[PDB]
Amino acid sequence: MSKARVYADVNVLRPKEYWDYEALTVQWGEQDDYEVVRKVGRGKYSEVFEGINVNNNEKCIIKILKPVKKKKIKREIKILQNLCGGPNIVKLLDIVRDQHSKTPSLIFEYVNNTDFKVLYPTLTDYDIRYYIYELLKALDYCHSQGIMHRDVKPHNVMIDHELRKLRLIDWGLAEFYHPGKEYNVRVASRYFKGPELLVDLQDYDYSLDMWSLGCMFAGMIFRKEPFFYGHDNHDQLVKIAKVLGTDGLNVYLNKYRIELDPQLEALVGRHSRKPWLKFMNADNQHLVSPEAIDFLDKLLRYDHQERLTALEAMTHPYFQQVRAAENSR
Ligand SMILES: Cc1cc(O)c2c(c1)C(=O)c1cc(O)cc(O)c1C2=O
C-alpha cells in the first residue's frame, strides 16, 4: 500500500517506446573503434577500463558487462539513453558488441575518478554540501524522468575534487517507476538498503534513493562509513532499529500493514531512539552542524513517504550557501 508523492505519472503519460526497454533494438557500434588502455576498477557485475577512440582520440570509459540476461542490458542502456543530458548523469557514447566473449560493452565519457576512502576524509564542511547538492540535482532529474537508480552509494558517485565535478553512475540496477508496481527488493547494496527492502514492502519508489543518500550523508558528516554496518539483510534492519528506535519501526509496519517475519522481529527486539548528536566526536565535529543533522534527519525516516524528495532537499537551508553561488556565477 504505497504510491510516489511526486513524478508518479511520468511514465504513465509517456510513449510506451520510452519505458518498454524489452521492445528495444540496440544499434551496436564498431568494436574496432575502441581499445582498452588500463583497467581502472569494478562496477558490480562489470569490469571497467580507461579507453580511447573511434577518431576523436580522447579518453573514455569502457564497461564490459558481466554476461547477464539480454533483459538487464536493454534496461541499463534504455535508461541511460533517457537520462543522457540530465545534470551530472553519466553520458553513454557507444554500445559495441562483444569483442571477446559473452557480453557487449558500454562506452561512457572519461570520469576522472577519485577515491571516497581517501577523498571523503579530506572533504571540508562546504565540499560536502556542494557535492550532495550536485548529486541531488542528478537524482531529481532521473526521478523527474520516472527512473529510480536503486543503488546510490559512495562508489556510484564519482567526484573529481579537482574539477569540482560529480557524476552518478552504474544504472545497472536502475528501473522505471510505475504506480502500484511491486519490484524486487534485491537491489542496491546492503549498507544503503532502505527499510522497505528489509521489511519487504515491494511497492517502493523514487524515495528509495533518498534513503540511500541519507546513509552516505551520515557516513560523511559523522565520518563512519558505512553508517549502517549490517552483517546481512536481517542485521541491517537491526543495526538501523538500534539507531532510529523500534517505536518508529512499529508505527511504520502498522501503517503499511506489513508483518515482520518471525526470526526477524526477535533479532530486532526493542530499542529506544538514539539522538543524532550522540554520534558526534572529535573527528566529526567540524561537519556535524544542527542544519546537517536536521537535513539528515529528514532523509532517514522509516516511512519512505516521509522522506524528503530530491527537489525538496535541494531547497533545504543546509544547502543555502551552495545555491547562493549559482544565482551569481
Ligand atoms: C554504468 C557505469 C558508468 C560509468 O561511467 C562507470 C561505471 C559504471 C563504473 O562501475 C566505474 C568503476 C570505477 O572503478 C571507475 C569508473 O570511472 C567507473 C565509471 O566511470
Both 223 and 290 in a single domain? yes
Cell matching residue 100:
571477446
88 sits in the region (left: phi over 0; alpha: psi -120 to 50; else beta) called: left
CATH code, 177:
1.10.510.10
Say if residue 223 is in the same domain as residue 144.
yes
User: Is 69 assigned to a binding site?
Assistant: no
| Domain boundary pick from 59, 84, 110 | 110
31 is written with which cell numbers?
A: 568494436
- Residues 139, 180: one domain? yes
Give the Cα separation of 294 and 299 in Å (integer): 9
CA of 107 to the centre of ligand 1 (A): 10
Beta strands 175-176 and 147-148, pairing class: antiparallel
188 and 175 in a single domain? The answer is: yes
Q: Is 42 assigned to a binding site? A: yes
Angle subtended at Cα 212 by Cα 210 and Cα 218, rounded to the nearest 5 degrees: 100
Which atom of ligand 1 is nearest the CA belonging to 171?
Answer: 1
**Residue 24 zone, left/alpha/beta (φ > 0; ψ -120 to 50; rest):** beta
Resolution in A: 2.6
Domain tally, the chain: 2
Q: Is 151 a catalytic residue?
A: yes
Atom of ligand 1 nearest to the CA of 109: 5
Distances (CA, A) of 12 to 161, 170, 175, 176, 181: 39, 25, 14, 10, 12
Choose the final residue of a domain: 94, 110, 126. 110
Do the beta carbons of residue 271 and residue 242 sit within 8 Å?
yes
- Entry field: residues in the chain: 329
Q: How many CB atoms within 10 Å of residue 77?
A: 19
Residues 135 and 9 placed together within one structural domain of the fold: yes
Q: Report the C-alpha gap between 9 and 6 in whole angstroms.
A: 8
Which residues are registered as beta bridge partners of 158?
167
Judge if 116 and 177 occupy the same domain: yes
Please check whether residues 172 and 209 belong to one and the same domain: yes
Output the nine-digit C-alpha cell for 208: 528509495
Residues 138 and 269 in one domain: yes
CA atoms within 13 A on the CB side of 82: 30
Work out which ligand 1 atom sits closest to the CA atom of 76: 1
**Residue 300, helix vs strand vs coil:** coil
Residues 122 and 14 in one domain: yes
301 is in an annotated binding site: no
Judge if 236 and 308 occupy the same domain: yes
Domain boundary at 91, 110, 129, which?
Answer: 110
167 and 307 in a single domain? The answer is yes
Count of CB atoms situated within 10 Å of the CB of 263: 9
Write out the residue range of the structural domain in which residue 65 sits.
20-110
Residue 320 C-alpha to ligand 1 middle, in angstroms? 30
288 and 227 in contact (C-beta within 8 Å)?
A: no
CATH of the domain at 60: 3.30.200.20
Based on the domain organization, do 201 and 72 belong to the same domain?
A: no
Q: Say if CB 3 and CB 12 are below 8 A apart.
A: no
Name the residue with the closest Cα to ligand 1, atom 9. 43
Experimental method of this PDB entry: X-ray
